[PDB]
């Protein structure tokens, strides 16, 4: 997705992980907030969501709870108290195009911040002065969205980086998106401790 229209795909009733992060598609660049990644073979959540998009690569510093860099604050303000982790890896080889893949967009501005998990696809010319904007397209009002410039000539910060912010949460409804429990052999006759699935 374009981050201005970011997907929020639910993940549900299946085995969650982070070990897969070290195999055929290991992350270039990654962060967690409020939790250690090691627990993602242990914990379980009611809901998980792939908040999925691309960024201008420098937004790795912006996409943080509490960090309030305006483009995020107009495209996807993460909850400023959220606890969790985020894919954000370089995708220049993929998403940049020779003439330039000028189809990944961000809201440049809005009349307010986004709230946590808000999405705004108001598309009228944003007012900044007076009178209804009515296509004035450059004085009182300006069109609020802009494409990223994704091209191989882009310096690394400007390059595309592919993002899945991983929202996950717990409710009165029981947890089901759970990390894999481990396994051990069927030793017999010896006196042992055991955990047969509880």
């Amino acid at each position, epitope marked *: 997705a374009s981050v201005y229209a970011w997907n929020r795909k639910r993940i549900s009733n299946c085995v969650a992980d982070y070990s897969v992060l070290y195999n055929s598609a290991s992350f270039s660049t990654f962060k967690c907030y409020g939790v250690s990644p090691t627990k993602l073979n242990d914990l379980c959540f009611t809901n998980v969501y792939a908040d999925s998009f691309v960024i201008r690569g420098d937004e790795v510093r912006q996409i943080a709870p509490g960090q309030t860099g305006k483009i995020a604050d107009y495209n996807y303000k993460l909850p400023d108290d959220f606890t969790g982790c985020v894919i954000a890896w370089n995708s220049n080889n993929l998403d940049s195009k020779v003439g330039g893949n*000028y189809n990944y967009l961000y809201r440049l501005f809005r009349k307010s911040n986004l709230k946590p998990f808000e999405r705004d696809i108001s598309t009228e010319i944003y007012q900044a002065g007076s009178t209804p904007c009515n296509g004035v*397209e*450059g004085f009182n009002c300006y069109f609020p969205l*802009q494409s990223y410039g994704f091209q191989p000539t882009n310096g690394v910060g400007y390059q595309p980086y592919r993002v899945v912010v991983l929202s996950f949460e717990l409710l009165h409804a029981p947890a089901t998106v759970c990390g894999p429990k481990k396994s051990t052999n069927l030793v017999k006759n010896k006196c042992v401790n055991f955990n047969f699935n509880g």
Partner: antibody
Amino acid sequence: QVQLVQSGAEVKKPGASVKVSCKASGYTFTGYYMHWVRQAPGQGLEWMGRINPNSGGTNYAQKFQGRVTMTRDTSISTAYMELSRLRSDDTAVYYCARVPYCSSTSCHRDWYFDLWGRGTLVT
Amino acid sequence: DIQMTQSPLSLPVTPGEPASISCRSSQSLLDSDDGNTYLDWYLQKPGQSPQLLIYTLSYRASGVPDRFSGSGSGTDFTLKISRVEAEDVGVYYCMQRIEFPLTFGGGTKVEI
């Protein structure tokens, strides 16, 4: 290298319509509005209009509306201007003109014009 | 739309020496909303669409023709030319983009 290169020759005697085009280079096409300007044997510089390419939005000078429209392809990083009818004396050095998006918030200095453009004697 | 009277018709500067072009205008180019002016000068080149002369009725273009300098407010366009090179033969323009539609100025030519 940054450039924006026009359609080549158009030459015909009057009364048919025309479409004129100009293709960017170097720069992110959405990073600039394209504007279209033309020569007059009198005044020289004359402005017809602007494309917000990312929106596709347009605005136009009162002199031209009924004939004129202008449009773009962002995927082809290329801009178009189209006119219902050319007079002999609507022969001009037509310009595609380059205009940066509002990198300055409030955009007034962003609305300096890169009127370097390129001119073509569409005839 | 704003009328943009340029004076002289032809800057007759014998080169080297300093000079000025002026363009009186009827109507506003003070950007007292946002500071500065929405006002630039432009010079149409011999064979080529114009290079920007001056931002904001005062501060120079990125092309460094420091032979030129500018000032004004409200509806004064003053162009002042501190030095003349023989290449400065050309047609100099005030223009408005404070409002849409645009207008181009009457032009001033340069010669000896």
